């Protein structure tokens, strides 16, 4: 079960929204622990979905990670992106805040009055995390709480923290990064992931250090691999295997280098 809307196709991936109409509700920073946001949840939907919380890390950042809400809401998920400037900073905050996000959700979601409750599977939790919250994401992916994880171009101290993580991982790396240099961050922290992990490695051709934060010239590729990423473990949806093991990913322009576990789920 869990499996939600229509058979996948790649125009269907790649178009700007999903299926689902979707509303939004604002999150003040004076609630949560978690610095304010904004859960996009889909109109028109039966039953229970998973959550994801998506977090930026990147103090003065010129732009953040927004547009994952909607892309990612409107395939069947509840969805809440995090505000910038909320005084966390360093990947062991940033753990931290994904905690407390994450308790926030929930706690909606056991609430009778919220405009999205019992909409959400607490058992069925991803994070998707950029810069020093894409540390974090890693940091809570080893901590065990959560079921899929995407970095994207992570920024943390070290690797040893995630040598033991078996959460469902995708690190977005951009390949042209200076502030998290892939060699240096994003790189080392997939390998340092066990190869019995569900794992995959995406270098974005060209990319700059904001190259996975989506509205951007790589929407194709993060809305394909990483709706697909989603959907695969957190619905256990056998029908978006075919985005992600299968393709010869790295023929794409786009995508400079690609390493993954493939086959998921045995
Ligand atoms: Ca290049
Ligand atoms: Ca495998």
């Given at each position: 079960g869990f499996q939600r809307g229509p058979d996948p196709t790649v125009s269907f991936l790649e178009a700007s929204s999903g299926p689902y109409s979707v509303r939004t509700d604002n999150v003040s920073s004076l609630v949560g622990g978690?610095?304010?946001?904004?859960?996009?949840?889909?109109?028109?939907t039966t039953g229970t979905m998973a959550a994801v919380v998506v977090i930026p890390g990147f103090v003065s950042?010129?732009?953040?990670?927004?547009?994952?809400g909607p892309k990612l809401a409107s395939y069947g998920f509840v969805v809440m992106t995090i505000d910038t400037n909320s005084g966390f900073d360093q990947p062991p905050s940033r753990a931290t805040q994904i905690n407390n996000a994450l308790d926030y959700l929930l706690?909606?979601?056991?609430?009778?009055?919220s405009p999205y409750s019992g909409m959400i599977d607490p058992n069925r939790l991803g994070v998707i995390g950029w810069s020093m919250g894409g540390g974090?994401?890693?940091?809570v992916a080893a901590e065990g709480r959560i079921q899929a994880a995407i970095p994207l171009a992570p920024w943390?101290?070290?690797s040893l923290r995630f040598r033991?993580?078996?959460?469902?991982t995708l690190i977005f790396a951009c390949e042209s990064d200076v502030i998290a240099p892939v060699g240096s961050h994003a790189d080392p922290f997939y390998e340092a992931i066990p190869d019995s992990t569900d794992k995959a490695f995406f270098e974005?051709?060209?990319?700059?250090?904001?190259?996975?934060?989506?509205?951007?010239?790589?929407?194709?590729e993060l809305g394909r691999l990483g709706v697909s990423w989603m959907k695969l473990h957190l619905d256990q949806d056998q029908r978006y295997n075919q985005f992600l093991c299968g393709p010869d990913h790295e023929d794409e322009y786009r995508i400079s280098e690609y390493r993954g576990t493939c086959p998921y789920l045995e």
């Open positions: 978690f610095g304010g946001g904004t859960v996009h949840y889909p109109t028109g950042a010129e732009s953040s990670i927004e547009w994952w706690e909606e979601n056991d609430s009778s009055s974090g994401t890693l940091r943390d101290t070290s033991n993580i078996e959460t469902p974005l051709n060209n990319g700059s250090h904001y190259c996975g934060n989506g509205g951007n010239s790589y929407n194709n």
